[PDB]
Design a protein around this ligand. Structure first.
Ligand code: CA
Ligand code: CA
Ligand code: CA
Lengths: 437, 446
């Protein structure tokens, strides 16, 4: 939630020296090195700011030293600018980040030529400011970044930046090919299950990516079979996360949106801009075409794969989950694992009962993918403020989602989330907990 | 939810000095102007409290500053009070907000007078505290509010501050019978379309029979409610059911039927509707004497026709009776529940960017209304553009509508929405803002 993370979304880490848009040798996280086509000077001005003319490649540790020195100089630049500083001080903490973002990118003085927009910002004429900035050469040169910044000025929010999900991806990615990070399928699976504790691309890694697909099973063990033999871009990671919680209907929207030419088939060209998915969906040399039935099945199998993996994680390798094991999963799924009241319900309110099978657990997970259908079906209960009894809940799940929850799954749900002891779940006790994570 | 959001529901924001039922001048979020026995005295008190010549009018930011001081002052009144602090310390976070709410409303000294109820709270005897507080003059003065606070003490959840619907029903209900309030079909229609406009009337058992009389003369389709007008009765529970119908996607029509069919025989009987004193809906579904069973096709038709009725009535409301909406009329409909700051930006965009182009037919309006039941699909479409780093220009907007509904919408509507919500004027749809306005517009009963 801060300028530093904003700018690592906006300015991408590059450990080799590189020409920018403007053509200047640059390095790290948008560090400007020299304004001289002399590359020899690019390693000189580099040196006394580093400890060595270069090393060819810088490494990340020092790249962050640079990035910190720039960000503060940027702030210092603004604070000692007559035109910028008043504006800067009228601004809330987030808008200041937006304006620091601007100076970091263009310099204190460039951002000082934006006379009118600066006026409007001080007046908190957010809308006129956003409109005027969007006509600038700066917008035209880097419109995706300028839009994110402008939206920050308009809304005083971080909605334009998804700082958390870019942080997850880098924390689990294990491969790199010229500044671009990559997950393996093992990395991807760990990232949806664990909070934490889970190199550069080579010709082996790429060759493994095809042969892995040749050896991996084609169903719900695809990613576990692949393991580290594969590659997933940041964009494909976000794509899978966006769709993996959806019912089938959401798969079909995603497919129709890829299918730009309308022939009910995805071509590698229609897919995002070789990864594991590209090879799976479009074959090795990129001329297989993906039909919806195959896409749907793939997404279904990945959902199942994730369910089976999480089941064995919380069962600790046993064939059945204890009710207490399912309860622990429920806390993490509902994002309530740090609320003491729920842990107390687990330890003290849960009968020893039958253990919970994989199939029962999968039915519960299937139900969770149809939550909005279930919420809509439950609206008379919710609007009436009428807490729901176990039997009525069971029936509603079956009617609204097709799923059969066992009394033992449902007993566990009710014992965990019934907070006032009436043996019923009010709207805030369960629906409110979900998606108001 | 927190004490701030709770009080924001319990205390209407008054940007102009307001004299409340208890006779106090108030401002902001329940800020009482105490040394003010007149309007002019209240302006003097307010000007000192804000440090500005306000003429009785403050800004949102000024209200928020007073609000924070008032909540801070309530907390301090609790922590420095021998009777209040031990109870507060003992309470969970939700019930602590309920105690701050009371001190905010009544003052530390007033709340400290509830000695037995306070004792019961500290002892975690929540039902018994609640029964005790409900008998008080405090409750009698502001019973809707006090009930929310007391129910928060009872359950320890925020349930009483969500899904609020009853106060709005009561606003519009024009009839009462033995303590229960009822809407006419006309009251219901007004409650759907208008923010606000009642002189409630009692009913004898004879008034009921004759009001319920004549149902067979009403139109069987999309004029049913308009044909009945004031000749019908709708209970609170039926009102909630009607609200659920209006927002309901076609995809959910059969599920809605099956939820009511509790014996699984593919028909709804009067006794199964009872799980939700004759009423219009009961007579229409189950006959005069409750003898008829309601089958799915008629139930689906009823829902479809109600949705059509609201759309036809709203179309003419904003077309002012003309056969086509102007683009500005469609904009007026769309923005009708938007709030002051954001509303001025959208209207600026209306005045400055819209061209009269082709006016908007009833069928085109209806198609837009149907689209609002596919907004999850539309949001997925927006995400797919975002992942592809594809700016959402008019063509992208059109395509997302087509994918979400399976039909193209008309250019006069899509181009109007796009010009309103191209907020930066860079030919990019601000689709998050658009969906926030739309979902709010279509969310009946708030
Ligand atoms: Ca295609
Ligand atoms: Ca409960
Ligand atoms: Ca039945």
């Amino acid at each position: 939630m801060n300028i530093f993370e904003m700018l690592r979304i906006d300015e991408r880490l590059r450990l080799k020296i590189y020409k920018d848009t403007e053509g200047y040798y640059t390095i790290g996280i948008g560090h400007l090195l020299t304004k001289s086509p002399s590359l020899n000077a690019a390693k000189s001005e580099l040196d006394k700011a580093i400890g060595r003319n270069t090393n060819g490649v810088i490494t990340k540790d020092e790249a962050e030293k640079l990035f910190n020195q720039d960000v503060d100089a940027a702030v210092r630049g603004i604070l000692r600018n007559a035109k910028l500083k008043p504006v800067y001080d009228s601004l809330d903490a987030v808008r200041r980040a937006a304006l620091i973002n601007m100076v970091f990118q263009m310099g204190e003085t460039g951002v000082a030529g934006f006379t009118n927009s600066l006026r409007m910002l001080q007046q908190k004429r957010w809308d006129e400011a956003a409109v005027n900035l969007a006509k600038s050469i700066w917008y035209n040169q880097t419109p995706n970044r300028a839009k994110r910044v402008i939206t920050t000025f308009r809304t005083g929010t971080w909605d334009a930046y998804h700082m958390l999900r870019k942080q997850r991806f880098m924390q689990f990615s294990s491969l790199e090919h010229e500044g671009e990070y990559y997950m393996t399928p093992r990395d991807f699976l760990f990232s949806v299950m664990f909070e934490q504790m889970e190199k550069k691309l080579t010709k082996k890694d790429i060759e493994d990516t095809l042969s892995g697909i040749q050896t991996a099973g084609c169903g719900s063990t695809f990613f576990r079979d692949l393991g580290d033999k594969g590659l997933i871009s940041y964009t494909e990671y976000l794509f899978l996360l966006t769709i993996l919680t959806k019912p089938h209907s959401g798969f079909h929207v995603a497919f129709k949106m890829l299918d730009t030419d309308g022939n009910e088939m995805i071509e590698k060209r229609e897919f995002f801009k070789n990864t594991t998915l590209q090879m799976r969906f479009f074959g090795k040399r990129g001329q297989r075409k993906l039909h919806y039935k195959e896409f749907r099945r793939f997404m279904e199998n990945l959902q199942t794969e994730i369910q089976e993996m999480e089941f064995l994680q919380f069962s600790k390798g046993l064939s059945f989950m204890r009710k207490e094991d399912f309860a622990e999963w429920l806390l993490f799924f509902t994002n309530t694992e740090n609320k003491d009241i729920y842990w107390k319900n687990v330890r003290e309110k849960l009968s020893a009962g039958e253990s919970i099978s994989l199939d029962e657990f999968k039915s519960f997970c299937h139900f969770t993918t149809h939550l909005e259908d279930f919420a809509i079906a439950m609206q008379m209960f919710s609007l009436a403020h009428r807490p729901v009894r176990l039997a009525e809940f069971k029936r509603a799940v079956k009617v609204a989602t097709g799923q059969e929850l066992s009394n033992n799954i449902l007993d566990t749900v009710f014992k965990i989330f019934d907070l006032d002891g009436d043996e019923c779940l009010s709207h805030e006790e369960f629906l409110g907990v979900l998606k108001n994570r």
